[PDB]
Enzyme design. Structure first.
Site, mmCIF file in Angstrom:
data_model
loop_
_atom_site.group_PDB
_atom_site.id
_atom_site.type_symbol
_atom_site.label_atom_id
_atom_site.label_comp_id
_atom_site.label_asym_id
_atom_site.label_seq_id
_atom_site.Cartn_x
_atom_site.Cartn_y
_atom_site.Cartn_z
ATOM 1 N N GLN A 73 -8.018 7.103 6.789
ATOM 2 C CA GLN A 73 -8.564 7.088 8.305
ATOM 3 C C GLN A 73 -9.387 8.090 8.256
ATOM 4 O O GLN A 73 -9.049 9.421 8.812
ATOM 5 C CB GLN A 73 -7.351 7.402 9.128
ATOM 6 C CG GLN A 73 -6.395 6.300 9.236
ATOM 7 C CD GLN A 73 -5.359 6.168 10.310
ATOM 8 O OE1 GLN A 73 -4.655 5.248 10.602
ATOM 9 N NE2 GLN A 73 -5.210 7.371 11.213
ATOM 10 N N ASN A 96 -7.450 -0.048 9.319
ATOM 11 C CA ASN A 96 -6.238 0.160 10.093
ATOM 12 C C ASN A 96 -6.554 -0.040 11.479
ATOM 13 O O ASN A 96 -7.459 0.305 12.039
ATOM 14 C CB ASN A 96 -5.852 1.751 9.852
ATOM 15 C CG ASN A 96 -5.396 2.101 8.572
ATOM 16 O OD1 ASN A 96 -5.121 1.213 7.603
ATOM 17 N ND2 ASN A 96 -5.045 3.375 8.397
ATOM 18 N N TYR A 144 -4.404 -0.447 15.286
ATOM 19 C CA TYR A 144 -3.320 -0.175 16.325
ATOM 20 C C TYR A 144 -3.701 -0.616 17.924
ATOM 21 O O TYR A 144 -2.864 -1.438 18.294
ATOM 22 C CB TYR A 144 -2.808 1.230 16.231
ATOM 23 C CG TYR A 144 -2.035 1.424 14.739
ATOM 24 C CD1 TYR A 144 -0.853 1.221 14.529
ATOM 25 C CD2 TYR A 144 -3.031 2.250 13.810
ATOM 26 C CE1 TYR A 144 -0.191 1.370 13.296
ATOM 27 C CE2 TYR A 144 -2.243 2.303 12.692
ATOM 28 C CZ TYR A 144 -0.967 2.279 12.524
ATOM 29 O OH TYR A 144 -0.414 2.424 11.237
ATOM 30 N N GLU A 161 -3.187 -1.102 7.657
ATOM 31 C CA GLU A 161 -2.119 -0.775 8.636
ATOM 32 C C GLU A 161 -2.239 -1.452 9.959
ATOM 33 O O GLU A 161 -3.316 -1.841 10.582
ATOM 34 C CB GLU A 161 -2.135 0.821 8.834
ATOM 35 C CG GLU A 161 -2.090 1.632 7.714
ATOM 36 C CD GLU A 161 -2.143 3.186 8.165
ATOM 37 O OE1 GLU A 161 -1.853 3.627 9.463
ATOM 38 O OE2 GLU A 161 -2.251 3.965 7.231
ATOM 39 N N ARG A 216 0.885 -1.255 -0.042
ATOM 40 C CA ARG A 216 -0.053 0.046 -0.063
ATOM 41 C C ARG A 216 0.909 1.263 -0.208
ATOM 42 O O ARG A 216 1.808 1.380 0.707
ATOM 43 C CB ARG A 216 -0.886 -0.171 1.165
ATOM 44 C CG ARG A 216 -1.712 1.291 1.470
ATOM 45 C CD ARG A 216 -2.687 1.020 2.474
ATOM 46 N NE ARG A 216 -3.328 2.276 2.746
ATOM 47 C CZ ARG A 216 -3.478 3.089 3.615
ATOM 48 N NH1 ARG A 216 -2.991 2.840 4.804
ATOM 49 N NH2 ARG A 216 -4.097 4.230 3.693
ATOM 50 N N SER A 264 -9.640 10.873 11.200
ATOM 51 C CA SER A 264 -8.481 11.772 11.836
ATOM 52 C C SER A 264 -8.353 13.103 11.434
ATOM 53 O O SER A 264 -8.159 13.994 12.097
ATOM 54 C CB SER A 264 -7.097 10.913 11.222
ATOM 55 O OG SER A 264 -7.097 9.689 11.531
#
Ligand SMILES: *[C@@H]1O[C@H](CO)[C@@H](O[C@@H]2O[C@H](CO)[C@@H](O[C@@H]3O[C@H](CO[C@H]4OC(CO)[C@@H](O)[C@H](O)[C@@H]4O)[C@@H](O)[C@H](O[C@H]4O[C@H](CO)[C@@H](O)[C@H](O)[C@@H]4O)[C@@H]3O[C@@H]3OC[C@@H](O)[C@H](O)[C@H]3O)[C@H](O)[C@H]2NC(C)=O)[C@H](O[C@@H]2O[C@@H](C)[C@@H](O)[C@@H](O)[C@@H]2O)[C@H]1NC(C)=O
Ligand SMILES: *[C@@H]1O[C@H](CO)[C@@H](O[C@@H]2O[C@H](CO)[C@@H](O[C@@H]3O[C@H](CO[C@H]4OC(CO)[C@@H](O)[C@H](O)[C@@H]4O)[C@@H](O)[C@H](O[C@H]4O[C@H](CO)[C@@H](O)[C@H](O)[C@@H]4O)[C@@H]3O[C@@H]3OC[C@@H](O)[C@H](O)[C@H]3O)[C@H](O)[C@H]2NC(C)=O)[C@H](O[C@@H]2O[C@@H](C)[C@@H](O)[C@@H](O)[C@@H]2O)[C@H]1NC(C)=O
Ligand SMILES: *[C@@H]1O[C@H](CO)[C@@H](O[C@@H]2O[C@H](CO)[C@@H](O[C@@H]3O[C@H](CO)[C@@H](O)[C@H](O)[C@@H]3O[C@@H]3OC[C@@H](O)[C@H](O)[C@H]3O)[C@H](O)[C@H]2NC(C)=O)[C@H](O[C@@H]2O[C@@H](C)[C@@H](O)[C@@H](O)[C@@H]2O)[C@H]1NC(C)=O
Ligand SMILES: *[C@@H]1O[C@H](CO)[C@@H](O[C@@H]2O[C@H](CO)[C@@H](O[C@@H]3O[C@H](CO)[C@@H](O)[C@H](O)[C@@H]3O[C@@H]3OC[C@@H](O)[C@H](O)[C@H]3O)[C@H](O)[C@H]2NC(C)=O)[C@H](O[C@@H]2O[C@@H](C)[C@@H](O)[C@@H](O)[C@@H]2O)[C@H]1NC(C)=O
Ligand SMILES: *[C@@H]1O[C@H](CO)[C@@H](O[C@@H]2O[C@H](CO)[C@@H](O)[C@H](O)[C@H]2NC(C)=O)[C@H](O)[C@H]1NC(C)=O
Ligand SMILES: *[C@@H]1O[C@H](CO)[C@@H](O[C@@H]2O[C@H](CO)[C@@H](O)[C@H](O)[C@H]2NC(C)=O)[C@H](O)[C@H]1NC(C)=O
Ligand SMILES: *[C@@H]1O[C@H](CO)[C@@H](O)[C@H](O)[C@H]1NC(C)=O
Ligand SMILES: *[C@@H]1O[C@H](CO)[C@@H](O)[C@H](O)[C@H]1NC(C)=O
Ligand SMILES: *[C@@H]1O[C@H](CO)[C@@H](O)[C@H](O)[C@H]1NC(C)=O
Ligand SMILES: *[C@@H]1O[C@H](CO)[C@@H](O)[C@H](O)[C@H]1NC(C)=O
Ligand SMILES: *[C@@H]1O[C@H](CO)[C@@H](O)[C@H](O)[C@H]1NC(C)=O
Ligand SMILES: *[C@@H]1O[C@H](CO)[C@@H](O)[C@H](O)[C@H]1NC(C)=O
Ligand SMILES: *[C@@H]1O[C@H](CO)[C@@H](O)[C@H](O)[C@H]1NC(C)=O
Ligand SMILES: *[C@@H]1O[C@H](CO)[C@@H](O)[C@H](O)[C@H]1NC(C)=O
Ligand SMILES: *[C@@H]1O[C@H](CO)[C@@H](O)[C@H](O)[C@H]1NC(C)=O
Ligand SMILES: *[C@@H]1O[C@H](CO)[C@@H](O)[C@H](O)[C@H]1NC(C)=O
Ligand SMILES: *[C@@H]1O[C@H](CO)[C@@H](O)[C@H](O)[C@H]1NC(C)=O
Ligand SMILES: *[C@@H]1O[C@H](CO)[C@@H](O)[C@H](O)[C@H]1NC(C)=O
Ligand SMILES: [Zn+2]
Lengths: 499, 499
Positions: free
Chosen positions: B185, B326, B328, B407, B93, B188
């Site tokens: 995202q 994504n 995290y 991600e 990506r 964000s």
């Protein structure tokens, strides 16, 4: 009777023989700077010098240096004032970054109050120390948005955006600022920004430099020069009609050079020399004094040269209270072909002249000005008498104007160590030899010159050269930019000013 | 039966127990990057991340670092391909910098052919090595001109400018690119760019951060989020109506988190946890699956929440072929007041939740994710099971979508020396523990996940952190950025991919 030296060695660094008292009591002495070169990007929007240096890093300087942080005069403006106070300077030329006060370019999009406050504090600090500000509205740093919306000075939309910016500056600062410069070095953006693409925005014809994003080196310089004159003149009209109560003066900045024949007994070289005066100086001074371009330009440039309407001619003619004349050097001129049909034709070729620092009999015009390490045959040499010749010419040809010398200076190499950099005797020699001739021309020719601002207050980002050369009368350590320490030249200039 | 670890020590770095063969044969494994973070400014126009990092250097990172040169993937894109080839990766990506292909923002102002050529060569090189591109159209790097003309995503003018940009990308690259991401995202930019002003463009209410140039943290996040959804949906409609012949797929990128109650027997904390799912995920997934915002947002946000017209609702609903998720970390949620009349109110307060990594009985959710040296009580901790919970939730709540994990990764400190930086066992542990849970959720819950792209290919500029943290699976020396050397994590990932 005044005698001035043209060749090394110079003895005019002795303030017993040449000092400020040699000039009229009211004469202003100081130094100059510009916003891109000193402030840093903190607190402002982006301009085309940010854009250009970032998109084309090898054009920013050999070190790929740029104005991102530089000497951080955003943070350390008081230290600049301190240098001026140490000098006992009576003038300081600085510029306002358009992108600091109107980051979005067009005034209706809002102003940056903190940016306005930055210049208020600088101005107030200067005046408190008895220093007269000379403020450049536009020292090349056009908001990037305007270049991207309409290609900046390429389009007539620039005129009203520049006018609204200038109006904000007069409104906010004109109660204290009494000397305004409109556009720095009128010749430079058209030719370097839109001709050779050495400077922002970096437009040219494809075969001139394949890296240019767009352009036409044969036509765009003329368009841009024309818009500069119109934008300048609109701002001067605004100033003189709406801000007359402020009691100040406004003018453009010219880059001046003298020109001498490469062969002074060859009619073709003599003709090229006179063409250069017209194409280099007259391109702008014809419009500013007469509302028309020089006839040789009309004839040569033909359909590529824009016309002024009668209203525009009247607006531009006489659009100055004074002239800011920058002067660095003089060139020899010889004939050169003008290949208007070549795909690599540039506006600069229209003068039909090739410029050198060595004449036909092998004489170099004067001492070294700038060494070119890639090609030493391209070194630049200076000529102190040229400031005399330029001022005399302006008086005689251009109707006895009021003049301030708004830049004059010389670089030393960034490869020198700090001790070598501070021992800048070559800068004393350059500055004093020019000041000698400036005094001489004022006395002998009665040119109305009322001040002199040396380039530069301190070391800074040099357009096209990064940090690979230094111009300052004070030294800045790039590892710790806070201090500005007077060099031998600054110490000499302090003594010249207060002998 | 699959068992996965939640706490240190992890044993999933043993490729005898966990490897690519644990997943379906077609599953894509690779890494991710973005254009601002890797390319450098050479060859492109300026964007709002250039603008923001330059105007607000202390917000760019503690080191004031920025994307000016970074890892120079403009020059060294082949070295990126080489890393991917070494990994035997099947996906990569990357993002297209809008400012590289349309420096003037609006397509009618012209394209940068050399910028187009840059991405053609990258794409061709990837495909030649058997790597599937996943291409993000917009990874936050909006051309500065658009922000200055109309404040970017704050204005509905963004929709057509984004559409014309995307159309150029599909036209130029869609014969080879079959997986497109629209906006990175979605949560964000509204919250960090227009709420807290931690991110470009840096707008907020005056009492939230006095350095913001303009803004309103209570209203602008919602406006911007709404325009993102509309711009996204217009591009997906363009793709699916005009580029169906290309046989590709398009979707948005979500930042996902899981949320757990700070106190799992307290109804108020349980309610805050469910509100967070709605306000964090549903803000975008409600529109994307149903054409409406969540009812709790309608109720709480009231007149500050824009409405979709029936035409807009229909355009946004179902505007994806897949979701790039994504992931995290996960947070605990507890109630918090929503002071809508306070001058420092932000959109983020509307969820009525306070987020922590420690629960009411003092349990830290998992291993350290990011140390905060100014305030250690603000350290972030990770939670491998959260990827399972997120994927399960998306399947159950959001209509069994096709998902690619676009991600997933962890930083190590930039204060570490090179040997410490290459010995990145904490990154192996993070990546493997998440991959274990991802395999588990695919097998147990039948979530339609078809690939995984770890953040990041190599060390790069990290938004907000400069070069003070490293995310790469390959190491870059900031004194000489040419090489990308696989770290222990990259070497592990190579073995995971080809066991
Ligand atoms: C200071 O500004 C003064 C103007 O305020 C400059 O004087 C003007 O100089 C112009 C030449 O540059 C003179 O214009 C020429 O006029 C003849 C005469 O036209 C009148 O009678 C004719 C003539 O037969 C009619 O057709 C015309 O309608 C008028 O009735 C023109 O042919 C000549 O046009 C040709 O030459 C132009 C190039 O110069 C070409 O561009 C054009 O296509 C023609 O091929 C020119 O006419 C001008 O043509 C372009 C039009 O845009 C423009 O409106 C038109 O005027 C002009 O007569 C003169 N004006 C006056 C009031 O004197 C003065 O120039 C300097 O001094 C003059 C005497 C001359 O020596 C110039 O070469 C010299 O530069 C400026 N001073 C300085 C220092 O620059
Ligand atoms: C998925 O999308 C579905 C729409 O395609 C969502 O269903 C819609 O949910 C809306 C509530 O969010 C329902 O609208 C309400 O309708 C009542 C009823 O109005 C009809 O009859 C009345 C009622 O007495 C008339 O005045 C009206 O003209 C109709 O004839 C409304 O009062 C209500 O309006 C008040 O509440 C709004 C806040 O919700 C305020 O913004 C508004 O000012 C009022 O104060 C609301 O009407 C909507 O008002 C705002 C207008 O912009 C909008 O056009 C108008 O519709 C709506 O009826 C329902 N549509 C259908 C087809 O079911 C669905 O919502 C989920 O499911 C519904 C059943 C409900 O449980 C929701 O809370 C829940 O979110 C969406 N699904 C998801 C998962 O989000
Ligand atoms: C400064 O410019 C002057 C004026 O142009 C230069 O002097 C001229 O130099 C020409 C040579 O470049 C001389 O012409 C030549 O004369 C000799 C003797 O008759 C002859 O054999 C040549 O073929 C040539 O003649 C020309 O050929 C081309 C024809 O189209 C043209 O009609 C002929 O003139 C010319 O006479 C001379 N003019 C004057 C007035 O002296 C001068 O050049 C320097 O001085 C001259 C005298 C000579 O010594 C050159 O070698 C020397 O370069 C130039 N000064 C410099 C330093 O370049
Ligand atoms: C997880 O959340 C649960 C549910 O909220 C917490 O348990 C509740 O904790 C309250 C104290 O924060 C308990 O109320 C108190 O009860 C004692 C004994 O009667 C009393 O003297 C107190 O004044 C207080 O009573 C409340 O006062 C405010 C009134 O508005 C309200 O009506 C009264 O309830 C409450 O009984 C208890 N609920 C349950 C179902 O146990 C829980 O707190 C943790 O466990 C409780 C049992 C207690 O040991 C707390 O010290 C301990 O923090 C919380 N868990 C954590 C780890 O925070
Ligand atoms: C610069 O712009 C000029 C003017 O548009 C171009 O010059 C013309 O070339 C057009 C096509 O040959 C010719 O028909 C005209 O006769 C020329 N006009 C004049 C005023 O010279 C020139 O080709 C452009 N240069 C570049 C490199 O694009
Ligand atoms: C954010 O924008 C809102 C909406 O324009 C402002 O909120 C309003 O404040 C106007 C003046 O008080 C009030 O009359 C309205 O009732 C409020 N409207 C709503 C929708 O809340 C708010 O003041 C602005 N915040 C900032 C810091 O400027
Ligand atoms: C200043 O220079 C003049 C010559 O121009 C000289 O007569 C005078 O004495 C010098 N002043 C001082 C203080 O040295
Ligand atoms: C410098 O940069 C430009 C790209 O902007 C490139 O075209 C040119 O080759 C480079 N110059 C040298 C001398 O390498
Ligand atoms: C002057 O200021 C007044 C008030 O804005 C305006 O009407 C007029 O157009 C301006 N003038 C110029 C450039 O003359
Ligand atoms: C193009 O210009 C360069 C410099 O201007 C010159 O050296 C070269 O001979 C020119 N070529 C043509 C085709 O005229
Ligand atoms: C930098 O220069 C200033 C002025 O000399 C000095 O006071 C400051 O301590 C220096 N900083 C460092 C890190 O040396
Ligand atoms: C400043 O210059 C003025 C004017 O010549 C002079 O009177 C004063 O002594 C000078 N001050 C210093 C410190 O040189
Ligand atoms: C791959 O992991 C599986 C367990 O998921 C294991 O059975 C297999 O042997 C491993 N492959 C290799 C080559 O180690
Ligand atoms: C950082 O920069 C902003 C100016 O953009 C300033 O308002 C703030 O004081 C600075 N922050 C710190 C912690 O110094
Ligand atoms: C599709 O392409 C055609 C040709 O430009 C255009 O007429 C139509 O409006 C475009 N479509 C979208 C987004 O549907
Ligand atoms: C403003 O907000 C900060 C953080 O959001 C908070 O700590 C402070 O108490 C608030 N002040 C008011 C007036 O509510
Ligand atoms: C920089 O790194 C590259 C790759 O290792 C190397 O080949 C090159 O020599 C290095 N440059 C310097 C100046 O050390
Ligand atoms: C690349 O992965 C393919 C597919 O699993 C495998 O067949 C091939 O051996 C791998 N190559 C290397 C060098 O690991
Ligand atoms: Zn920069």
């Amino acid at each position: 009777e005044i005698t001035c030296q043209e060749n090394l060695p110079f003895t005019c660094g002795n303030t017993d023989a040449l000092n400020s008292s040699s000039f009229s009591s009211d004469f202003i002495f100081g130094v100059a700077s510009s916003a891109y070169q000193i402030e840093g990007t903190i607190g402002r929007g982006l301009n085309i010098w940010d854009g250009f240096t970032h998109r084309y890093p090898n054009k920013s300087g050999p070190d790929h240096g740029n104005g991102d942080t530089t000497c951080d005069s955003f943070s350390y403006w008081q230290k600049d004032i301190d240098v001026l106070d140490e000098l006992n300077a009576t003038g300081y030329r600085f510029s306002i970054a358009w992108s600091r006060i109107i980051p979005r370019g067009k005034r209706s999009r809002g102003v940056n109050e903190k940016g306005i406050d930055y210049y208020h504090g600088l101005i107030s600090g200067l005046i408190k120390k008895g220093i007269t500000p000379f403020v450049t509205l536009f020292h090349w740093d056009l908001p990037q948005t305007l270049q991207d919306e309409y290609e900046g000075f390429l389009d007539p939309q620039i005129i009203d955006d520049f006018k609204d910016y200038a109006d904000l500056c007069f409104e906010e600062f004109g109660d204290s600022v009494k000397y305004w410069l409109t556009i720095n070095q009128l010749y430079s953006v058209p030719t370097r920004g839109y001709g050779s693409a050495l400077d922002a925005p970096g437009r040219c014809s494809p075969t001139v430099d394949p890296s240019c994003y767009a352009g036409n080196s044969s036509t765009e310089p003329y368009i841009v020069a024309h818009h500069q004159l119109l934008a300048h003149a609109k701002v001067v009209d605004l100033y003189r009609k709406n801000y007359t109560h402020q009691g100040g003066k406004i003018g453009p900045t010219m880059i001046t050079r003298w020109f001498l024949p490469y062969n002074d007994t060859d009619r073709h070289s003599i003709a090229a020399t006179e063409r250069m005066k017209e194409f280099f100086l007259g391109w702008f001074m014809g419009p500013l004094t007469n509302g028309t371009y020089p006839q040789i330009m009309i004839d040569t440039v033909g359909e590529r040269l824009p016309s002024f309407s009668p209203e525009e001619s009247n607006l531009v003619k006489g659009s100055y209270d004074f002239l800011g004349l920058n002067y660095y050097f003089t060139q020899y001129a010889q004939p050169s072909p003008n290949p208007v049909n070549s795909t690599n034709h540039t506006a600069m070729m229209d003068a039909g002249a090739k410029l050198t620092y060595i004449n036909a009999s092998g004489h170099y015009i004067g001492p070294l000005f700038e060494k070119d390490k890639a090609d030493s045959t391209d070194n630049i040499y200076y000529y102190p008498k040229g400031i005399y010749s330029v001022m005399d010419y302006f008086k005689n040809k251009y109707y006895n104007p009021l003049i301030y010398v708004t830049e004059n200076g010389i670089s030393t190499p960034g490869d020198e160590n700090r001790n070598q950099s501070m021992l800048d005797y070559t800068r004393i020699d350059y500055l004093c030899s020019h000041l000698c001739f400036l005094n001489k021309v004022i006395k002998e020719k009665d040119v109305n010159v009322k001040g002199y601002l040396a380039w530069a207050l301190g070391d800074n980002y040099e357009f096209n050269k990064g940090f690979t050369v230094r111009f300052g009368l004070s030294y800045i350590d790039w590892n710790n930019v806070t201090d500005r320490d007077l060099k031998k030249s600054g110490q000499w200039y302090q003594s010249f000013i207060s002998p």
